[PDB]
mmCIF file of C-alpha atoms and ligand atoms in Angstrom:
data_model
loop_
_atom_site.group_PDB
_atom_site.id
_atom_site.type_symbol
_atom_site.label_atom_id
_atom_site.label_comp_id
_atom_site.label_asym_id
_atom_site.label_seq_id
_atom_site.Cartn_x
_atom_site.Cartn_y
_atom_site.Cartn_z
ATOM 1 C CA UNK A 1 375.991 118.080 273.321
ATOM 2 C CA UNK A 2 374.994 121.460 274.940
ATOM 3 C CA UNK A 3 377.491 120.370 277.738
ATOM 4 C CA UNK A 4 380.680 117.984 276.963
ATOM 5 C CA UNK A 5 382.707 116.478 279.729
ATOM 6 C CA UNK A 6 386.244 117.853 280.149
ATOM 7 C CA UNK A 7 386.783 124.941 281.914
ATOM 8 C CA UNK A 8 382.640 124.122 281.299
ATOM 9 C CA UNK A 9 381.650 126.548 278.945
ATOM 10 C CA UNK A 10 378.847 128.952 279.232
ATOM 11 C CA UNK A 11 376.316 130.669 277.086
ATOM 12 C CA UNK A 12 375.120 134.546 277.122
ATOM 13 C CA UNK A 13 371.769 134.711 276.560
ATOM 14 C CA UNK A 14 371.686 138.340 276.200
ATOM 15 C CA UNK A 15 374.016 138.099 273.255
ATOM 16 C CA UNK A 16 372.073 135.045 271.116
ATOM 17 C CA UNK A 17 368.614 136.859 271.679
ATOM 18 C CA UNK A 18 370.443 139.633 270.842
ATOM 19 C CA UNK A 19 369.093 141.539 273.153
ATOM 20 C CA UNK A 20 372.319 144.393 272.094
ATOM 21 C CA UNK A 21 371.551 143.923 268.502
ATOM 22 C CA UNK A 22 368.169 145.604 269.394
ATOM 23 C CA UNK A 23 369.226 148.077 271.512
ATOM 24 C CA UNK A 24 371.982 149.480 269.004
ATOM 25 C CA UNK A 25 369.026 149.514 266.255
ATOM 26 C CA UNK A 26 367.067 151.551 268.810
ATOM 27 C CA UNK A 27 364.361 149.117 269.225
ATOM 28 C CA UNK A 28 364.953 148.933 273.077
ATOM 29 C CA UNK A 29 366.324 151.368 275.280
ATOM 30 C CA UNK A 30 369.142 150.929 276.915
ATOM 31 C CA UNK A 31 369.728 152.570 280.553
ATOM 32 C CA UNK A 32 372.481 152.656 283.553
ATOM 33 C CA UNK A 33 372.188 149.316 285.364
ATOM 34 C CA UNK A 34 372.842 148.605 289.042
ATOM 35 C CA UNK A 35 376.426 150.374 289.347
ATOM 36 C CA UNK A 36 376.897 153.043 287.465
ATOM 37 C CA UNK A 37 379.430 151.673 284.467
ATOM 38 C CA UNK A 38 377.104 149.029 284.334
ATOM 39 C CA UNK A 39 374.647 148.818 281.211
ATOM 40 C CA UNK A 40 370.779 147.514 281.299
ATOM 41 C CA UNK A 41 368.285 146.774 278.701
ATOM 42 C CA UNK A 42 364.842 148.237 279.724
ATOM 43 C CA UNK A 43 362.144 145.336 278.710
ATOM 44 C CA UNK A 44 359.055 144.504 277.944
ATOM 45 C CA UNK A 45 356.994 146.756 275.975
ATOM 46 C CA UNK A 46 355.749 144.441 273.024
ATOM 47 C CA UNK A 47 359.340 143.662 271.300
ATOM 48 C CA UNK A 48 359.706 139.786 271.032
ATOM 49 C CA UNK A 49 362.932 138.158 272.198
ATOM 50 C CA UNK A 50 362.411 134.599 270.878
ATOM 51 C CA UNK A 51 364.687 131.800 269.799
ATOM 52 C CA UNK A 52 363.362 128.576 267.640
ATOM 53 C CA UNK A 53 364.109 125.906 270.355
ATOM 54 C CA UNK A 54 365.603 123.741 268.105
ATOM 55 C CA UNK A 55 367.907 126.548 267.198
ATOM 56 C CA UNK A 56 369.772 126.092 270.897
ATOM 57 C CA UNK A 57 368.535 122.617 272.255
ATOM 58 C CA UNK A 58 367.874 119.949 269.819
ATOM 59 C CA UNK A 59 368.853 117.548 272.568
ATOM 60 C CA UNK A 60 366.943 119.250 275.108
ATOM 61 C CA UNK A 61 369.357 120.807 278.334
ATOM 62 C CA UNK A 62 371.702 118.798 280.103
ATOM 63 C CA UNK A 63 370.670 116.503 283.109
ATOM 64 C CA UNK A 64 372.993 119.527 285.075
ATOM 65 C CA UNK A 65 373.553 122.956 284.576
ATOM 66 C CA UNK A 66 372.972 126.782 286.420
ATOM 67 C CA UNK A 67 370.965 129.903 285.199
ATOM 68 C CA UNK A 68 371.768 133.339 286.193
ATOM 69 C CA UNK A 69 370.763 136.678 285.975
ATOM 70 C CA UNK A 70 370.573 140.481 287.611
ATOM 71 C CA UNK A 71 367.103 142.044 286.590
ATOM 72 C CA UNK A 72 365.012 145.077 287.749
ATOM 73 C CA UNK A 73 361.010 144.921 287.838
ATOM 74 C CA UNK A 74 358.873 147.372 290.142
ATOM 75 C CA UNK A 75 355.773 149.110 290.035
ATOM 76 C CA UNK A 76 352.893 146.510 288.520
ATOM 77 C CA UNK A 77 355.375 144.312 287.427
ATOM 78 C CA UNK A 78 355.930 142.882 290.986
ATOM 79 C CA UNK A 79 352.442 141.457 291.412
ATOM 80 C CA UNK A 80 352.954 139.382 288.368
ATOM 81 C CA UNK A 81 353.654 135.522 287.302
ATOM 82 C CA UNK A 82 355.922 135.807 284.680
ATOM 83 C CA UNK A 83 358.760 133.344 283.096
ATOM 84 C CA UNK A 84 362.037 135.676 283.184
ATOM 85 C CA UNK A 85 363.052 132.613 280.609
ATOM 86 C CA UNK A 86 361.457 129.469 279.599
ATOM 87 C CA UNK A 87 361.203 127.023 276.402
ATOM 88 C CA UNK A 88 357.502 126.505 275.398
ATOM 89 C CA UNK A 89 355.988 123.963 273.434
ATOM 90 C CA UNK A 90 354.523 125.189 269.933
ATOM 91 C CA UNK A 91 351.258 125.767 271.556
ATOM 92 C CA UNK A 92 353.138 127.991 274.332
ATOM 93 C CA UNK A 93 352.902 125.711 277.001
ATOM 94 C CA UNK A 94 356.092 125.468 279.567
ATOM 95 C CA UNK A 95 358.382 122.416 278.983
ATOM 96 C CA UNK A 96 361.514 124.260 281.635
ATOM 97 C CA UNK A 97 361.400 127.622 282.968
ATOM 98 C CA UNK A 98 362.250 130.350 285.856
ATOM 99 C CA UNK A 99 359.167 132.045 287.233
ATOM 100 C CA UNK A 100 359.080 135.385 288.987
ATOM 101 C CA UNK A 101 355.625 134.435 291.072
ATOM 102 C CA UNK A 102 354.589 137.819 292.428
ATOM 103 C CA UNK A 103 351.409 136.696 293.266
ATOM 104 C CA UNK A 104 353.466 134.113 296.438
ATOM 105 C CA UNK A 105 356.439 136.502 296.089
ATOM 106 C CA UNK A 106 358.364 133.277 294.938
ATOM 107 C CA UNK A 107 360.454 131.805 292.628
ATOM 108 C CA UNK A 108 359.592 128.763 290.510
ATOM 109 C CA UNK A 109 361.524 126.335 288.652
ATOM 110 C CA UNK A 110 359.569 124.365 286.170
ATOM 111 C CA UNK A 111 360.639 121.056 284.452
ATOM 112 C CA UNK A 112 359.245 118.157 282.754
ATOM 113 C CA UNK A 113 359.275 114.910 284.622
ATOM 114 C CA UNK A 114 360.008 111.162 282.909
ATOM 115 C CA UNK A 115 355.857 111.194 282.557
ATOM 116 C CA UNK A 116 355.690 114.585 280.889
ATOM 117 C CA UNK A 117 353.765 116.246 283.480
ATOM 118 C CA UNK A 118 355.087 119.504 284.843
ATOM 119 C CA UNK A 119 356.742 119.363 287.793
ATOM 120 C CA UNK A 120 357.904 121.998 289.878
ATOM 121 C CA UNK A 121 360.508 123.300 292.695
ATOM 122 C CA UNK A 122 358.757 126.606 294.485
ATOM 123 C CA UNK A 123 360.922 128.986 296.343
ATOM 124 C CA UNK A 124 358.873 130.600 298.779
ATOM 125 C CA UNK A 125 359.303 133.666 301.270
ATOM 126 C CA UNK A 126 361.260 136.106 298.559
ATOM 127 C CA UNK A 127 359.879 139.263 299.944
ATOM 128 C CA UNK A 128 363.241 140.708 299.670
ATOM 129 C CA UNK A 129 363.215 140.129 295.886
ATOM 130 C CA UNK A 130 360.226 142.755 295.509
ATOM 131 C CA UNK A 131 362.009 145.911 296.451
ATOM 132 C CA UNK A 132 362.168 147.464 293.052
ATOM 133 C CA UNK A 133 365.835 147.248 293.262
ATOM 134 C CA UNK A 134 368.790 145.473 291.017
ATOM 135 C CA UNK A 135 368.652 141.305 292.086
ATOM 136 C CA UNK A 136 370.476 138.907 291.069
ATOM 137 C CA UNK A 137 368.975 135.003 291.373
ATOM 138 C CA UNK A 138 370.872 131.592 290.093
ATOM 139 C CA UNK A 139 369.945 128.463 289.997
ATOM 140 C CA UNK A 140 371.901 125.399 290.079
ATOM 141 C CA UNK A 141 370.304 122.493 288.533
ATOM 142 C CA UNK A 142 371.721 119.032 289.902
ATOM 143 C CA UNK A 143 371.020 115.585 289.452
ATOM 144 C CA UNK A 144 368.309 115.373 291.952
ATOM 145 C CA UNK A 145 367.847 119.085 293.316
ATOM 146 C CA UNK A 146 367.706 123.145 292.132
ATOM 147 C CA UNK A 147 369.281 125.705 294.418
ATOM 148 C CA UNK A 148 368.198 128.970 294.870
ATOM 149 C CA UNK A 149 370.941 132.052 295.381
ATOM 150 C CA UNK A 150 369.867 135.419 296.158
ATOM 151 C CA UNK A 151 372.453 138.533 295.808
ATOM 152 C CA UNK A 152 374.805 136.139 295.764
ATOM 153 C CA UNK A 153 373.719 134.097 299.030
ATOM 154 C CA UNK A 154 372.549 130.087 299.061
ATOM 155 C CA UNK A 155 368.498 130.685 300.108
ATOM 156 C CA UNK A 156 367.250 127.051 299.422
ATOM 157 C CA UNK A 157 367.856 123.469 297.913
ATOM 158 C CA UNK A 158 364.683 121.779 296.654
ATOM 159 C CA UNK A 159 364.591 118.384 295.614
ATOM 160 C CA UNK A 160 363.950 117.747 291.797
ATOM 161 C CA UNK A 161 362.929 114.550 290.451
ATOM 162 C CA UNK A 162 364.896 113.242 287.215
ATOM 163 C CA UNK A 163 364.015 115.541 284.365
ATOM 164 C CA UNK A 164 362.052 113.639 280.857
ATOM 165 C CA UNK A 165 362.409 114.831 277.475
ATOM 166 C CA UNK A 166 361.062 118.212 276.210
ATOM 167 C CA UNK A 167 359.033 119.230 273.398
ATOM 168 C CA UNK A 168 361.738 121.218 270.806
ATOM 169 C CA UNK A 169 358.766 122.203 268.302
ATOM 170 C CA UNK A 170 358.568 125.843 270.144
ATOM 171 C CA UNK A 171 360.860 127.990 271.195
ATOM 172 C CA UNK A 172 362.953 129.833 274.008
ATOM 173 C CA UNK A 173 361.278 133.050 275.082
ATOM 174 C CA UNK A 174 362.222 135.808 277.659
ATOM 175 C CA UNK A 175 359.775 137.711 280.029
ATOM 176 C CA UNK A 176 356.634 136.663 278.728
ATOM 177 C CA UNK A 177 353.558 136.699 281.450
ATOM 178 C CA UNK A 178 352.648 133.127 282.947
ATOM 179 C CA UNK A 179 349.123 132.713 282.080
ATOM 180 C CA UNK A 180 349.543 134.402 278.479
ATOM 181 C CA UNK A 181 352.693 133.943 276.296
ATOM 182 C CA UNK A 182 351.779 136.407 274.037
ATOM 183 C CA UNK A 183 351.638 139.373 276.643
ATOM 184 C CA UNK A 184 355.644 140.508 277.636
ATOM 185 C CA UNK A 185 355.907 142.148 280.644
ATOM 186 C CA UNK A 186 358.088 144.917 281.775
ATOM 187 C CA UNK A 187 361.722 145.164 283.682
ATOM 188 C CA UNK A 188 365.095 145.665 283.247
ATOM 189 C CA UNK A 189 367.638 143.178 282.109
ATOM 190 C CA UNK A 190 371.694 143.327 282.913
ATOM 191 C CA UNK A 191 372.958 139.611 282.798
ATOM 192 C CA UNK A 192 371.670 136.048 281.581
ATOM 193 C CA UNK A 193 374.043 133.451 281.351
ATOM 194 C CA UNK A 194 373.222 129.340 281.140
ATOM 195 C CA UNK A 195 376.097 127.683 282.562
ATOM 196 C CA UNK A 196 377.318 124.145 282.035
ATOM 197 C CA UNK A 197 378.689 123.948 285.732
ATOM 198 C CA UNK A 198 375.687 123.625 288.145
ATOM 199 C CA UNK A 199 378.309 124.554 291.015
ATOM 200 C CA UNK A 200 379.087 128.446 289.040
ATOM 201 C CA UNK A 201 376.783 130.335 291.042
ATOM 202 C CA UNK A 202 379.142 129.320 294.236
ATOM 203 C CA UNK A 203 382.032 131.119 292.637
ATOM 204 C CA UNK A 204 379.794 134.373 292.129
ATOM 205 C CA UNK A 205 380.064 137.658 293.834
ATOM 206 C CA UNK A 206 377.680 140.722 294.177
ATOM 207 C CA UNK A 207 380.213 143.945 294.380
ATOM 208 C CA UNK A 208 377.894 145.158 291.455
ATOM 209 C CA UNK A 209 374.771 145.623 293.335
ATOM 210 C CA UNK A 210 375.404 148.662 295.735
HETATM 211 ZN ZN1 LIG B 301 354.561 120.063 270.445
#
């Protein structure tokens, strides 16, 4: 549904949580992102960016698919576990998600297996990501593995094991901390985009991060 057969079509996440909307009613502030006609959204900071999952995904995601985005986090922010995006369960708990682990200096994709348990794909050895400058990380889900691009180079494949359905009763959050999702946490957002062809981070270049 999300993702017909057939170019694929893509979704900006920073335009359905309306992460603009809020920023042009002066509930966040906006700042210059990583170039300098480029535009960020400074996050965090108790303001709620949260879609009903069912909104997006009654189905769920696709069996294939990539997720990318250029953020900013520093000072505090880089010794935390927290979900840059994720759908949660009602209760808050993680059904798929993208973790920024600060704690390992990682990056974790979450999913639920055909059991429901949580499984997981850890990126490891990210130091680079912790600088407090612009980065931009994708993910390209496939059949059986998730691959990890950093600044617009291939870091890792990890193999995935076949995803099972996902609770729908919740809802699709950004930057909320790992433990607590309640708490938000903050950084700097410039681009979020869920992307029906697993293969689009190959095609991506980084000219905007000087
Ligand atoms: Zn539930």
């Amino acid at each position: 549904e999300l993702c017909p057969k057939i170019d694929l079509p893509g979704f900006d996440l920073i335009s359905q949580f309306q992460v603009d909307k809020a920023a042009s009613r002066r509930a966040i502030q906006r700042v210059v992102g990583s170039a300098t006609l480029q535009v960020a959204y400074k996050l965090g900071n108790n303001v709620d960016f949260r879609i009903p999952t069912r909104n997006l995904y009654p189905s769920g995601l696709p069996e294939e698919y990539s997720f990318l985005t250029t953020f900013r986090m520093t000072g505090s922010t880089l010794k935390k576990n927290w979900n840059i995006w994720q759908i949660q369960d009602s209760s808050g708990k993680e059904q798929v998600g993208i973790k920024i682990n600060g704690q390992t200096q990682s990056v974790v994709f979450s999913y639920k297996g055909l059991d429901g348990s949580l499984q997981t794909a850890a990126f490891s050895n990210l130091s680079s990501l912790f600088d407090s400058q612009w980065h931009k990380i994708m993910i390209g889900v496939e059949r059986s593995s998730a691959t990890l691009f950093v600044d617009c180079n291939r870091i890792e494949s990890l193999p995935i094991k076949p995803r099972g359905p996902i609770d729908i009763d919740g809802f699709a959050v950004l930057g909320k901390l790992a433990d607590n999702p309640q708490v938000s946490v903050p950084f700097e957002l410039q681009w979020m985009l869920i992307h029906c062809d697993p293969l689009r981070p190959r095609r991506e270049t980084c000219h905007e991060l000087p």
